[PDB]
Amino acid sequence: DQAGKSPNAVRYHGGDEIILQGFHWNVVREAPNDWYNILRQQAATIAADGFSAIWMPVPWRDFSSWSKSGGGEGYFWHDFNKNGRYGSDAQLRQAASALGGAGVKVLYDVVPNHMNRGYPDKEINLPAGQGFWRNDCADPGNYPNDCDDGDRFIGGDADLNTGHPQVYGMFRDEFTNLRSQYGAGGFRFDFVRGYAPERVNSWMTDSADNSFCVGELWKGPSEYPNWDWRNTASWQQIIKDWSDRAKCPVFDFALKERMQNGSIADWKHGLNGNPDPRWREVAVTFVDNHDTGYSPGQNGGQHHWALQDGLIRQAYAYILTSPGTPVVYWDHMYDWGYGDFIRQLIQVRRAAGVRADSAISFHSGYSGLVATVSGSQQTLVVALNSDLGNPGQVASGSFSEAVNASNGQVRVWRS
Ligand SMILES: [Ca+2]
Ligand SMILES: [Ca+2]
């Protein structure tokens, strides 16, 4: 592996990461208090499968509940105690040391925007009136107020004033803690629309300046005020702006939006397809996650914006062979039968030396998605749901088949 910031000082850690989302939505229910044991036991396999990093569930205990039903997944934690629904504190330390030991850096999902303010028994009790909360200030609607420079989570009553010195400090100390005793190699920031992106850069600078980070900004242009430039900008411009200020890579929701609403040919409009390397290199691509996708168990997970089933192979072949930093959803990899296929694609990625900044060109003269990726080791031609006959039609050089599945609907050639 290779470390290092981008030419723009963005924390993409060498730009050579291949990440595994180490969980799905119903884990706390399907494998009660045993997930950390499972991950430690799977560390060897995960490393062998080709992953360089693993996005772990939120480590802060969550005993919340609601009724569909849910709770305890970590996005409504009541304090930093590690004895939550995924396993014990000791178990977390053992899983993290095993993963880190196998060459898989541990990236922690962190939720700074809010907390289970009403939980009865917690180690973090911030009173009202001191400005620790968003609702300490007048809260007219879902937009920044005097006690919160970001959007709010639902009603906003559990929103923290992450800008308050004490609140900012307690998070900073915990990130240092995670890095110091829980083998964290970086962080995945949750609900980044809820607080200033600059604060994320501050936290990283303070606790893990040279680590890897990714933030999820999930907000369409239509969610911005008509006077805000973002209101008429593209999904790409919006997430790129956040990455600029947070100096952290950002989940490619521009690509996800095209995967959900456009044609496969239109996938080229994701952030990872941008002709400017400073733009695509900060994109963290994915197919589905614990929120957008399905999950084994209860109600099939959240599946708030799930990829059409018949595009799963195409989606993975695309993100694993193109620029940006790819993320593989736990379930596709280990529960639904795409593991072998994904394993092959990861090896194709490493063999060609595709990086977050590798060049990519698109070819519209054929059906489907056709592209040429200039990896550091080899050049790849990718044809998904295309009537392309041979790679020589779009690129010069000696090419050999690297992938050919789904009746040629998924074809990759390498030089
Ligand atoms: Ca790296
Ligand atoms: Ca907020």
Curated annotation (Swiss-Prot):
Cysteines paired by S-S bonds: 137-147, 213-248
Main location class: secreted
Pathway in which the depicted protein is active: Glycan degradation; starch degradation
Sites marked Transition state stabilizer: 291
Cofactor note: Binds 2 calcium ions per subunit.
Gene Ontology MF, one: metal ion binding
GO-annotated biological processes: starch catabolic process
CC annotations in GO: extracellular region
Compartment list: Secreted
Effect of residue 190 to N: Abolishes enzyme activity
Binding site for Ca(2+) 1: 1-2, 13, 16-17
EC assignment: 3.2.1.60
Cofactor(s) of this protein: Ca(2+)
Positions with a binding annotation for Ca(2+) 2: 113, 148, 151, 159, 194
Catalytic activity annotation: Hydrolysis of (1->4)-alpha-D-glucosidic linkages in amylaceous polysaccharides, to remove successive maltotetraose residues from the non-reducing chain ends
Other facts noted in the record for this chain: There are several isoenzyme forms of this protein.
Subunit structure and binding partners: Monomer.
Family assignment from sequence similarity: Belongs to the glycosyl hydrolase 13 family.
Protein name: Glucan 1,4-alpha-maltotetraohydrolase
Source organism: Stutzerimonas stutzeri (Pseudomonas stutzeri)
